[PDB]
Design a protein around this nucleic acid. Structure first.
Ligand SMILES: CON(C)Cc1ccc(O)c2c1C[C@H]1C[C@H]3[C@H](N(C)C)C(O)=C(C(N)=O)C(=O)[C@@]3(O)C(O)=C1C2=O
Ligand SMILES: [Mg+2]
Ligand SMILES: [Mg+2]
Ligand SMILES: [Mg+2]
Ligand SMILES: [Mg+2]
Ligand SMILES: [Mg+2]
Ligand SMILES: [Mg+2]
Ligand SMILES: [Mg+2]
Ligand SMILES: [Mg+2]
Ligand SMILES: [Mg+2]
Ligand SMILES: [Mg+2]
Ligand SMILES: [Mg+2]
Ligand SMILES: [Mg+2]
Ligand SMILES: [Mg+2]
Ligand SMILES: [Mg+2]
Ligand SMILES: [Mg+2]
Ligand SMILES: [Mg+2]
Ligand SMILES: [Mg+2]
Ligand SMILES: [Mg+2]
Ligand SMILES: [Mg+2]
Ligand SMILES: [Mg+2]
Ligand SMILES: [Mg+2]
Ligand SMILES: [Mg+2]
Ligand SMILES: [Mg+2]
Ligand SMILES: [Mg+2]
Ligand SMILES: [Mg+2]
Ligand SMILES: [Mg+2]
Ligand SMILES: [Mg+2]
Ligand SMILES: [Mg+2]
Ligand SMILES: [Mg+2]
Ligand SMILES: [Mg+2]
Ligand SMILES: [Mg+2]
Ligand SMILES: [Mg+2]
Ligand SMILES: [Mg+2]
Ligand SMILES: [Mg+2]
Ligand SMILES: [Mg+2]
Ligand SMILES: [Mg+2]
Ligand SMILES: [Mg+2]
Ligand SMILES: [Mg+2]
Ligand SMILES: [Mg+2]
Ligand SMILES: [Mg+2]
Ligand SMILES: [Mg+2]
Ligand SMILES: [Mg+2]
Ligand SMILES: [Mg+2]
Ligand SMILES: [Mg+2]
Ligand SMILES: [Mg+2]
Ligand SMILES: [Mg+2]
Ligand SMILES: [Mg+2]
Ligand SMILES: [Mg+2]
Ligand SMILES: [Mg+2]
Ligand SMILES: [Mg+2]
Ligand SMILES: [Mg+2]
Ligand SMILES: [Mg+2]
Ligand SMILES: [Mg+2]
Ligand SMILES: [Mg+2]
Ligand SMILES: [Mg+2]
Ligand SMILES: [Mg+2]
Ligand SMILES: [Mg+2]
Ligand SMILES: [Mg+2]
Ligand SMILES: [Mg+2]
Ligand SMILES: [Mg+2]
Ligand SMILES: [Mg+2]
Ligand SMILES: [Mg+2]
Ligand SMILES: [Mg+2]
Ligand SMILES: [Mg+2]
Ligand SMILES: [Mg+2]
Ligand SMILES: [Mg+2]
Ligand SMILES: [Mg+2]
Ligand SMILES: [Mg+2]
Ligand SMILES: [Mg+2]
Ligand SMILES: [Mg+2]
Ligand SMILES: [Mg+2]
Ligand SMILES: [Mg+2]
Ligand SMILES: [Mg+2]
Ligand SMILES: [Mg+2]
Ligand SMILES: [Mg+2]
Ligand SMILES: [Mg+2]
Ligand SMILES: [Mg+2]
Ligand SMILES: [Mg+2]
Ligand SMILES: [Mg+2]
Ligand SMILES: [Mg+2]
Ligand SMILES: [Mg+2]
Ligand SMILES: [Mg+2]
Ligand SMILES: [Mg+2]
Ligand SMILES: [Mg+2]
Ligand SMILES: [Mg+2]
Ligand SMILES: [Mg+2]
Ligand SMILES: [Mg+2]
Ligand SMILES: [Mg+2]
Ligand SMILES: [Mg+2]
Ligand SMILES: [Mg+2]
Ligand SMILES: [Mg+2]
Ligand SMILES: [Mg+2]
Ligand SMILES: [Mg+2]
Ligand SMILES: [Mg+2]
Ligand SMILES: [Mg+2]
Ligand SMILES: [Mg+2]
Ligand SMILES: [Mg+2]
Ligand SMILES: [Mg+2]
Ligand SMILES: [Mg+2]
Ligand SMILES: [Mg+2]
Ligand SMILES: [Mg+2]
Ligand SMILES: [Mg+2]
Ligand SMILES: [Mg+2]
Ligand SMILES: [Mg+2]
Ligand SMILES: [Mg+2]
Ligand SMILES: [Mg+2]
Ligand SMILES: [Mg+2]
Ligand SMILES: [Mg+2]
Ligand SMILES: [Mg+2]
Ligand SMILES: [Mg+2]
Ligand SMILES: [Mg+2]
Lengths: 44, 274
RNA sequence: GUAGCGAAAUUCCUUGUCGGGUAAGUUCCGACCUGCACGAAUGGAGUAACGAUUUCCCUACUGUCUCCACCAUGAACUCGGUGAAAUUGCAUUACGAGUAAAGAUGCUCGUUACGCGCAGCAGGACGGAAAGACCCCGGGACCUUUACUAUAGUUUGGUAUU
RNA sequence: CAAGGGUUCCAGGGUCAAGUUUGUCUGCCCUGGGUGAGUCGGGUCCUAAGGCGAGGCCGACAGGCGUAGUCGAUGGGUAACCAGUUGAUAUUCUGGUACCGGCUUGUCACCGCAAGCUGCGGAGGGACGCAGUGAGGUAGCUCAUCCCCGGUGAUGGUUGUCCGGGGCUAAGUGUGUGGACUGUCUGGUAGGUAAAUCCGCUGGGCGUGAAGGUUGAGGCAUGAUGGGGAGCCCAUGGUUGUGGGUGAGUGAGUGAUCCUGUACUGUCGAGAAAAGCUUCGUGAGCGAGGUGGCGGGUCCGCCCGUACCCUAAACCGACACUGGUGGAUAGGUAGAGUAUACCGAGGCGAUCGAGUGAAUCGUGGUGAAGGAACUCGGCAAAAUGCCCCCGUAACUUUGGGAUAAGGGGGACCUGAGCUGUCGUGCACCCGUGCGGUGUGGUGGCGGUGAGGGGCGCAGAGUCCAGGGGGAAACGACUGUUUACCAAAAACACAGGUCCGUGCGAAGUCGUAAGACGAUGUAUACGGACUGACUCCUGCCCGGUGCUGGAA
RNA sequence: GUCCGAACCCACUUCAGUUGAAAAUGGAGGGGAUGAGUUGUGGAUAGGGGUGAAAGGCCAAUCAAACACCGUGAUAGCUGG
């Protein structure tokens, strides 16, 4: 059937992209937390 | 007028439609249109603040001159009478005798070719716009300004009518279509005559679809909701509200006008009653 | 408690009573009113048309049935290849009448039974799957209100702005 | 093709793993290779929804909103086609022939408070719904005694039209047939943010009763002496390609979902924006007496994508999963059809098999007599089914009910006449040299056919394809709903009533500013209940609520 | 918001499946099919909140208050060890 994940690169980049995260202070703190943890992927 | 539909199909059975006899032109003036995207009843916060709004046929806004006093003394010919989807009245397209074209609410009785004018020395004819000090007492006007220079705000819908009853001092007393008696500044402008298309209220839409493309979404009455959704919600089987009638937000029925504002200019309340 | 309607999606008694339909009708349709406990915009009574709605009947039609038979196929079955699953205290795991935590393969007294497989059927192992969803007790959640205590909001007056 | 995937694509080597079996094979592994654009799809251009937002306003802080702006396609704008080639790429490379923008150059013509260029805006334009019919075309398709290239048949016949195949070419340019568009010459001018000679609004003169002009469905010409297109050659090389051998390009029927066409007609629910573009000036600067125009020549033309899968074994579903996935093309015969049956272009034989008349389960098939006796219940199945013609009840809101019900005919052979269209041809208007027009043609093709006839159990012979009637309850109706046990009598609904709201509306979101309501104004808006329509809607204000009043 | 009927959308009945081909489907029928239709792309509304032709429905395969992390080794007169 139609499943939950329907990919769209533009929507993904607008939602979880680096600039989207940098727009708000919550996203900036998320990037900081991922940097502290050591993720190689800071954002989508 | 109104044209009654024949009962060929259900939903067309009791319905009716205006015959559009007064329209002289089936297209609008291109230079007086702006885009009017739909809101769906949503706020600038993106939430529904006015319910029951959405969908409907696409519409283009017609720029209506509700001031009329920046063309004082310039006669205009009523070039056309045409349809405005944004209102229950018709719109008269006016060709001023200087090249400027404009739109007004079409007064009842005016048609293609008649000459309208604005100003204190304007003649008292339907469609002419004058200050209230110059409009004679006992006259039926429309498109009345609350504050001088603010533009038309009262008596604008189809068939609307305002009665000028007195001009004592620096205030003119007007009976609004609600029947309320109100005082306004004599310098406030008004257009002679009443609004046309007065018979549109008798239109039977006869069809859920016609309001659906008029832009009205279905209305779910609160008594068939759940208690979390509406104070009238709940109950086993069909019930009443289980309480006195209230709004979906728990506000009891009652007068809601702010008792302390411009009440010093209201002579008597509308007196709907029964 | 009016018009209207009434054993009704409402009638407990109840398969009320009478009438129609059937060879036979607790359902049905028309009546009666004795309305346990109808009723007029939480609308009353009707209503052509509409309905994958509910109910009754007639006709046509048939394997629905009397009453099943036969045919072909995908599994099943045999051979070669590949190869799981839930479950699992144990094992060389009968029946009868008993007995016992009151329903026994396992205890008593008897009876029967050579060892091991294959295809099958589901009576039992209180079979498997889900720390019963009913009940009660403890806790929680959400909902309600003329429960308590508060509060946003709305409103009153004072005072500052004055 | 898009989305998504990301090297799966190609060649060679490999068979541990993966593949529901095997495997020499692979979408697997290993190595190397493969994607070429001024025109295609995006960016360099434009805006929609929406996002962000200099200042700004609002908010203890954090922040909210928003102006000027600036982004943002799913839309607007925008110049190229055919053929050929590779193991893998092709509106990209190559061939042929075009187009667009620059730079530069040759030549001709022209300007000069007064060139031009660039900014800046004005106006025009871009620019818009839904539904329907018809007309003129073309694509396509069919047929052919016509033109080509073959064939003469394993078994009776098969050298005449008997059989098979083919009967082709683009963008661009020119032409201007249908069709469409369009009076002309001057004057004035409260408007178009600064202006306008470009617009708008108005005054006159003349004016066919259309005549020119402008335009451009197709056709023709050109592009094209080219390209493409079968079987004959010493030969090739023997699952091969080379050089010659390419032959034809006819006519009719039928006919679009395409073109004219945003046409035309109908219609209420009244159907984006902005830029490019044309023109107008000048609220800006540049700029010399140098530019700007029309034909001709040279060079310059950027970035990203381009392989491959893609109604799927490569995407979304943990799988190489009977599921889901937007768009384009979509031939023949029977048919109303994009249904269905069998076929075409093309692609597949499906990723464990071999057997064997067990019971049994699934999936189909048939059935004597009976025909709902089954069962909670006609559940399932059967019957009915198509077209044409005849005919059709209670009731009704006059529309319906209705395909009511209930009947007849259908295919095959032959076939008189009637028609669609074309036709060499007759005469004729000819504006002929018109790409024409009306009479008019033995005929070809197609459609339709009264009548007559044949055969069978059966002629809508297969697939496909309503059972019908009577009555009651509920809801008027079409719709909507518990994704994953309830589709209903529930919700909605059109209609109705009451209450609120005089506009900074009430109401709602928010701390606020603001916003929706609404660029609406009481014939409106918000809330409540009721729920088409018909006839109606009684009595009670004590209680509670609401409204008003204030001793 | 006509009728019959494909695509398309739906999900009424039945059978099968129910360690499925499939964490909701398949076969046979069935409803809508010019409309309150359906669908693509992008966008908006966010957790006591959204949205809801209203079923407490839906909000990333279990919603009478999502998910993740944190307070946190919550607490449990209860069950187990
Ligand atoms: C008519 O009486 N019969 C005997 C009962 C019954 C009959 C038919 C059914 O189809 C179901 C049930 C019981 C309910 C129980 C429900 C319950 N829940 C509502 C709290 C629950 O606890 C679970 C669960 N997941 O544990 C469920 O399954 C549940 O939701 C569900 O679906 C049910 C059913 O399907
Ligand atoms: Mg998801
Ligand atoms: Mg314009
Ligand atoms: Mg915001
Ligand atoms: Mg509403
Ligand atoms: Mg409106
Ligand atoms: Mg409910
Ligand atoms: Mg509440
Ligand atoms: Mg309630
Ligand atoms: Mg009750
Ligand atoms: Mg009885
Ligand atoms: Mg009883
Ligand atoms: Mg009886
Ligand atoms: Mg009453
Ligand atoms: Mg009542
Ligand atoms: Mg009642
Ligand atoms: Mg009712
Ligand atoms: Mg009733
Ligand atoms: Mg009825
Ligand atoms: Mg139904
Ligand atoms: Mg019978
Ligand atoms: Mg088998
Ligand atoms: Mg085996
Ligand atoms: Mg005992
Ligand atoms: Mg025993
Ligand atoms: Mg024993
Ligand atoms: Mg022992
Ligand atoms: Mg055994
Ligand atoms: Mg067995
Ligand atoms: Mg057993
Ligand atoms: Mg058990
Ligand atoms: Mg327990
Ligand atoms: Mg449970
Ligand atoms: Mg259970
Ligand atoms: Mg509690
Ligand atoms: Mg919970
Ligand atoms: Mg105060
Ligand atoms: Mg004070
Ligand atoms: Mg790629
Ligand atoms: Mg590789
Ligand atoms: Mg790979
Ligand atoms: Mg490969
Ligand atoms: Mg293997
Ligand atoms: Mg290999
Ligand atoms: Mg290989
Ligand atoms: Mg730019
Ligand atoms: Mg914007
Ligand atoms: Mg700032
Ligand atoms: Mg820009
Ligand atoms: Mg952009
Ligand atoms: Mg390729
Ligand atoms: Mg090519
Ligand atoms: Mg080339
Ligand atoms: Mg402009
Ligand atoms: Mg427009
Ligand atoms: Mg022979
Ligand atoms: Mg041929
Ligand atoms: Mg001027
Ligand atoms: Mg000016
Ligand atoms: Mg035609
Ligand atoms: Mg490529
Ligand atoms: Mg390719
Ligand atoms: Mg394909
Ligand atoms: Mg698949
Ligand atoms: Mg996968
Ligand atoms: Mg045919
Ligand atoms: Mg088919
Ligand atoms: Mg083939
Ligand atoms: Mg394929
Ligand atoms: Mg496989
Ligand atoms: Mg066997
Ligand atoms: Mg059968
Ligand atoms: Mg037989
Ligand atoms: Mg029989
Ligand atoms: Mg028989
Ligand atoms: Mg019979
Ligand atoms: Mg019986
Ligand atoms: Mg029986
Ligand atoms: Mg049935
Ligand atoms: Mg059948
Ligand atoms: Mg009829
Ligand atoms: Mg009939
Ligand atoms: Mg005949
Ligand atoms: Mg027959
Ligand atoms: Mg047929
Ligand atoms: Mg009755
Ligand atoms: Mg009854
Ligand atoms: Mg209904
Ligand atoms: Mg209704
Ligand atoms: Mg329905
Ligand atoms: Mg829906
Ligand atoms: Mg369901
Ligand atoms: Mg209403
Ligand atoms: Mg307010
Ligand atoms: Mg506003
Ligand atoms: Mg109701
Ligand atoms: Mg009283
Ligand atoms: Mg009272
Ligand atoms: Mg009071
Ligand atoms: Mg319909
Ligand atoms: Mg689809
Ligand atoms: Mg269901
Ligand atoms: Mg089952
Ligand atoms: Mg229907
Ligand atoms: Mg978004
Ligand atoms: Mg409930
Ligand atoms: Mg969910
Ligand atoms: Mg909570
Ligand atoms: Mg909620
Ligand atoms: Mg703590
Ligand atoms: Mg503990
Ligand atoms: Mg325990």
């Amino acid at each position: 059937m139609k499943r939950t994940f329907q990919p769209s690169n533009r929507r993904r980049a607008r939602n979880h992209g680096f600039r989207s995260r940098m727009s708000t202070r919550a996203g900036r703190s998320i990037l900081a937390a991922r940097r502290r943890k050591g993720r190689v992927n800071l954002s989508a | 007028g109104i044209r009654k539909y024949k009962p060929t199909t259900p939903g067309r059975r009791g319905s009716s439609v205006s015959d559009f006899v007064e329209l002289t032109r089936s297209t609008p003036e291109k230079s007086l249109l702006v885009a009017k995207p739909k809101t769906g009843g949503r706020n600038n916060t993106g939430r529904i603040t006015t319910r029951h709004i959405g969908g409907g046929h696409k519409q283009a806004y017609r720029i209506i001159d509700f001031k009329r006093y920046d063309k004082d003394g310039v006669p205009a010919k009523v070039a056309h009478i045409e349809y405005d989807p944004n209102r229950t009245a018709r719109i008269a397209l006016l060709h001023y005798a200087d090249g400027e074209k404009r739109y007004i609410i079409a007064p009842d009785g005016v048609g293609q070719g008649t000459v309208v004018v604005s100003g204190p020395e304007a003649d008292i004819k339907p469609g002419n716009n004058l200050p209230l000090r110059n409009i004679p007492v006992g006259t039926t006007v429309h498109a009345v300004e609350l504050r001088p220079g603010g533009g038309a705000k009262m008596g604008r819908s189809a068939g609307a009518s305002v009665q000028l009853v007195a001009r004592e001092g620096k205030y003119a007393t007007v009976r609004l279509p609600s029947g309320e008696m109100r005082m306004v500044d004599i310098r406030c402008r008004a257009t002679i005559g009443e609004v046309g298309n007065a018979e549109q209220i008798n239109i039977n839409w006869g069809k859920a679809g016609r309001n659906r493309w008029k832009g009205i979404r279905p209305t779910v009455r609160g008594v068939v909701m759940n208690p979390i959704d509406h104070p009238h919600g709940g109950g086993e089987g069909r019930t009443s509200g289980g309480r006195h009638p209230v709004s979906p937000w728990g506000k009891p029925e009652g007068r809601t006008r702010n008792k302390k504002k411009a009440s010093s200019r209201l002579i008597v309340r509308r007196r709907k009653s029964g």
